[PDB]
Structure formats: structure tokens, C-alpha cells
């Protein structure tokens, strides 16, 4: 395909401002509808997965309108992301040639533990993702993914109407036909509001809850919660000088001690770039996954930048999430003059391993805009009692929160966000096609299940949070427990086998492995007797003992219950195909390798001879997938053929549980 300026173009012809250039791309127009069946308030990651996933599960049937307070995507913290996510992009036709062109490349999840009375000590806990033709996960800076679904939607009859607010006072929401008469304007000072009635409104307004929070008061779970304050870092080339032994930049990183843990995120950022050249170039990256166009004759990120006039830079995401239990000094100013700085480098001259870290590290001022060369943000854990009624439904962080850790937010939150979005065909056909009291009775029938799945979701999560944090407490309980129970309790089973059918299905299915018996079973032990120790002690090594042998005993027999074959000793760093940990054990799989031009992470796979972030051709590592223990050219075969395309719909077959095997 031969790009096109048509965004760029037009902005600069009509000097139009960032949402009306945005706007004009929708399908109905640039301005509101006077009529919509779905209303979404939020146009975050889960609004326009929402959207998405309506759309596509079964078109022309919904006309949707996304409504966004953001001229523009917004900034987000929430940038990791994990296999469910990368299948559902794919599933909705972009998959890993295209969508690294625009986010960082993820592979594995690897978690360091800090020693805190004896500094310098630390274990770790190692892991890989996938092979280049098996899947990827993503790093994605969010105003990026807010962007690329913002188009993607328009493409699929779904309108998004940005530097638009929808106005919770005088809107109204109600059972009914078409009952809802949705109040929209460009902020308060707006004397000429307009109004979009419609069947249903989904608050996507994330920790915002902007409509339920109407339904119900903020609900707080017992002991401590979290706080998080976090900043933005160059991404260094050479990572040789990090003081973690085989530490690579494309894993989410975690560096875990008693207090809590820090993110590391390796990520690239469009910042600075006009928002209509962005569209230009999101669009022809669409043109190019639509035409499938191959890897190595897609141009690079960089030469992207260069073709639709972008800003384009590398660098990491790094933040602390810590108990809020936390004592802190009275006076911090010796750190700094803001809050958010203070604590992060009070915090990072605790730990002399930390120190080390961050010295490797470069701080980058108000990567996006003013004041933002820091953020904090308080008390993160929380639920809505309410997530439905007559005329709404609530998704994503709408729905509740727990920590960053594992990433559940994006990646557990898109089952809300997918089963609402399946779930509305048959709540506007009820609506049009029965009279209204038993149109309501129906719908909510409907919905009990949603509201029950929600009602037990945060809780699970939150004492996943809980179990991972208590571990981190110990540099043994941390990988042989709490990291071990949730890669095999969580690791998504089946996922091969997933489409857009069965995809809503699936993941409120998967919950990170928390809903898993046995899991439950270890975390309350572990929990029951850590929150006994107070923070600011260790754990007295009989503890760590007795920990470790019942979560050992428990695993030996969950594991040999389990029927799903997996090669555990090449994804694992630490433990044998039988999930025991070895203590000295180095061997596992190796699916990728850092550019030597532009530091960039890559898949390896043999048509991608070329950098997909700055098109250095590299001399033939490609092939060079590393299979420890090794596989034939059948099996290597084999694998690739599982995953290349998802299977066709079948109302006959069932689904595939992600959990572990339930014993006899
Ligand atoms: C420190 C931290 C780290 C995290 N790290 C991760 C991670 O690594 N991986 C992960 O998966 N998750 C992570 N999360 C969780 C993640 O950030 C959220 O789950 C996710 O951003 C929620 O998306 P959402 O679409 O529900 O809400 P948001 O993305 O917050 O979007 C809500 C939208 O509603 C809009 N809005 C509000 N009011 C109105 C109105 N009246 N009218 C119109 N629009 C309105 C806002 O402008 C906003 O765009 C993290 C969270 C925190 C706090
Ligand atoms: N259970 C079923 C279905 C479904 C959807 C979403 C959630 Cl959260 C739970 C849930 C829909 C099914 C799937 N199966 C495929 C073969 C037979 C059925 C039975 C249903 C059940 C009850 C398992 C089917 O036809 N639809
Ligand atoms: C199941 C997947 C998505 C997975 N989910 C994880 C969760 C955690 Cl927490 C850690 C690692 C993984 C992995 C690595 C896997 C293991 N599978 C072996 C055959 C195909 C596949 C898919 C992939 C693979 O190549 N790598
Ligand atoms: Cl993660
Ligand atoms: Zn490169």
C-alpha cells in the first residue's frame, strides 16, 4: 500500500483542532447523533475494547457511540500487557508484525527479590514468553493503544467522539425502550449541551465510576492497600551494567522486596507527534495488516517516524506499588521538592540493589506535558458494589481494581469489558422486541451472572495481591511460592484454541488462575501467618520453612493432576518439567535477542531477517530460536502449526478450561 496523508492534510486545510480531526474520521460524522443504541461514557482501553469486541462479535446490529472527555488519548499508567490480550488484537485482525511497529515487544515475566537485612543478597524467578510464530505480548504506551483502537473502531461502524463529556447530572438513565437520554457537551462551561437517546449506557469511566459510583458507595477491602508513585527513564542499549544476573529489558521486570514491588517497562513513546499524522500512520499500518503485508517489507518504527513526521524515543517505565502501611521519615525534602519524587528516590536509596538498578537510568522530564515528570496515586485497591441496572452496565476499572502486579486491570479486566460487549446484542433486542416490566426482569436475569462474576472478581484479586505481596517478604517464598502458584494456576491453557465466539467465555474463565482451589488453598495459608509478622521485621526462618514445605505438598499433587502438557523446564528458568525448583538450573528457551543498532528487543523467526523498530538487517539469529530441552523439526513444526490461525466458531464443541486439571 502507498501511505496516505489524508489526516495530516486535512487538519492542516481546515485547521482543525485535535478532536475535530480525530472526529472527522467517524463513520456518522464529526458531530454527535441524535440517536444511538449504545452509549459508552469512557473512551480508555475498555470502552473501545468494548466497542470492539460488540462490533465484531456480531456487526451491523448495535450503532455505538464512544464518548471521551480527552481531545486526544490521554496519558495512562497501565502499559503491560500479556497473551490474552495479544490473541484478542489478533482475533480482530492485527497481530505481532504489525502491532510491534507501534508498542514494545514483552517476553517473559521476571521478578528479582531483595533481601532487606541483607543487602546485596537477591533470588529471582525467571521466565520467557513465546516463539515469533507462536504470539507476543506488548509493552504499549496507552495514548498509543487509545489511538490505534480509536481507528480500528471507526473502521468497524463504531463512532468515538473525543473532547466530549458526558454530563452525569443531568443525564438520564432508565429501563424502557430507548430510555436513556444521554447529556453530552465540551465541559461545564457548555451552555449547549446535546443529548443522544439511546437503549444503553456502559460507564467506562474507569476508577472515575462516574455513573456508578451513583449506585452504590466505593467499596474498600480490610488491611492495608497500596500506594504507587513512578516515573519515566531513558531506555539504555546496553543493559550488561544492570546488577542482576541474566536480566533482559523486554520482560516486564519486577523488583520485589518486603514493602511492595517496582516495575520496569521497556517501552518505545510516540510523544510529541501531531495527533493527525499519528492517524495517518495508524492508518496505514491498519492498510497493511488488512493487505498482510510481511514483516520484513513493513517499514520500521523509526522509518514510520520519518515517513508521517513522528517524534519516536525508547524508554522505561519504573514505579513502585507499596503497602500503604509503610512508615515513612517526617521531612523528605532532602529528595526532592514533590511527594511522588520523594518517596520513589527515598524509597530507591533503601535498597543498595535498587540504587544500583536506577543508576543504569536516566529521568525524563514531562514525557507527556507539564507535571508529569512524577505521579502518585493513593489507596489503588477498591470495588463497586453495583455494576448494573436498568438502562447501564459498568466494565473495566469501572468495575474495581486491585494493584499493577500480573497486569490484571487490561488483561482480567477485558473479560468485563468482552461479556458486556457480547452480552448487549440480546439487552437492546430485549428492549425493542417485549414491553417494558418484562424487558427489565429479563435483562436483569440476564445480567446476574455479569453481576456475580464482578461481585467475586475483586476479591480474588485482591487476595492474589495479597498472597504475592506477603511472599515478597522472603527471596524463597517469593519465586518457589507465590510466583510458581500463579504461573501454574494462571498459565492460559487452551488459549490456541480461543476465538471471537468464545472469547468472553474464556477469559471470565481464566482470573489469572485466582479462582483455582488449590491456589486459594496455599494463599490463605501463606497470608494467615505473614500478615501475623509485622512489617518492619523478617520472617523468622521456621516460618519460611513451614511455608515452603506446605506449598510444596500442595503443588506435587495440583501438578500431576494436571492433564495440559508444557515443557516447564524451558520456560522456567529454576524449576524441571515436573515443576520442582533446581537450585543451580540456567537452561531455557530463548525466543529473543536485542538489535546491536537501536537496542530494540525482537522475535526471532526466519522471515524477520530485518529490525522491526529500525530496519538493521541482522545476519541470521532468526532461525536461531533456542529449544532447551531441544525439539525435533516435527515438533518445532507442530507448535507453529497450533497457533497460526485461530479455529472457526463450533456451537458443538466445548470450551477449554485455562485452569489446571480438576483431580478424580
Ligand atoms: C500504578 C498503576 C500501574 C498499573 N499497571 C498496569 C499494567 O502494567 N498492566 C495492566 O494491565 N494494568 C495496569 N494498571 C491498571 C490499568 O491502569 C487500568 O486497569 C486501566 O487503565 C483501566 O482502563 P479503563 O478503560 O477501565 O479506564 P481508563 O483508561 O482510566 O479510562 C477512563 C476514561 O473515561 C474518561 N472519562 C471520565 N469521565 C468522563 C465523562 N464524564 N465523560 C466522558 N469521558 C469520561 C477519561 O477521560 C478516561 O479516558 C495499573 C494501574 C495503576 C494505578
Ligand atoms: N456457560 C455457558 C455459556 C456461557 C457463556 C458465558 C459464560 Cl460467563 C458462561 C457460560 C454458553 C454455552 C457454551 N456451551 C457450548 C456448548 C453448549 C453450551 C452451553 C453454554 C454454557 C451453559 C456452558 C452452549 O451452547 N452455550
Ligand atoms: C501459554 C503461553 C501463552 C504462556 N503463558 C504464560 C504465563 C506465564 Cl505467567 C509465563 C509463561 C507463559 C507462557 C509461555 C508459553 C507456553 N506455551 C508452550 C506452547 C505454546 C506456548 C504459549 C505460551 C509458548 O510458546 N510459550
Ligand atoms: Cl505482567
Ligand atoms: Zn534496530
Known sequence: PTPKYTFTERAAAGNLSDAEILNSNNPTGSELPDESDVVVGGAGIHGLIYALHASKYKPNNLKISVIEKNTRPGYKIGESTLPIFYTWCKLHGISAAYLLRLFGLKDGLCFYFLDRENQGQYTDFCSVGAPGLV???????????????????????????????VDFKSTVVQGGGQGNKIAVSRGKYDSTPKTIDSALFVDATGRFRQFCSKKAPRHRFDGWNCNAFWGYFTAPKDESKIPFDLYEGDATNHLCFPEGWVWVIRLPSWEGSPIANLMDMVTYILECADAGVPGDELPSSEELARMFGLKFQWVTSIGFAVRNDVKYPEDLSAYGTREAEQKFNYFVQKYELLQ????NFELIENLYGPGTTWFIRKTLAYQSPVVSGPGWLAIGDACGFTNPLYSPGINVGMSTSTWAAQLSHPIVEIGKSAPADAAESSIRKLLVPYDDYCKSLVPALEQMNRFNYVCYRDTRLGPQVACLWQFFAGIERYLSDVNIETFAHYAIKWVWGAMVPEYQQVAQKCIEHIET????????????????????????????????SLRWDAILRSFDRSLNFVEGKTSRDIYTRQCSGCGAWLQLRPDWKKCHSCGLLGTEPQTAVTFDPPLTAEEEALLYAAWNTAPKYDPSKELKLPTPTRPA
Open 356 to 359: 544500583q538498578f536506577m543508576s
Open 533 to 564: 509478622v509485622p512489617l518492619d521485621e523478617r520472617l523468622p526462618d521456621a516460618m519460611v520453612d513451614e511455608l515452603l514445605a506446605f506449598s510444596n505438598r500442595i503443588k506435587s499433587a495440583a501438578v500431576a493432576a494436571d492433564d495440559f
Open 135 to 165: 504470539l507476543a505480548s506488548l509493552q504499549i504506551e496507552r495514548p498509543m493503544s487509545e489511538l490505534l483502537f480509536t481507528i480500528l473502531a471507526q473502521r468497524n461502524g463504531v463512532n468515538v467522539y473525543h473532547g466530549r463529556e
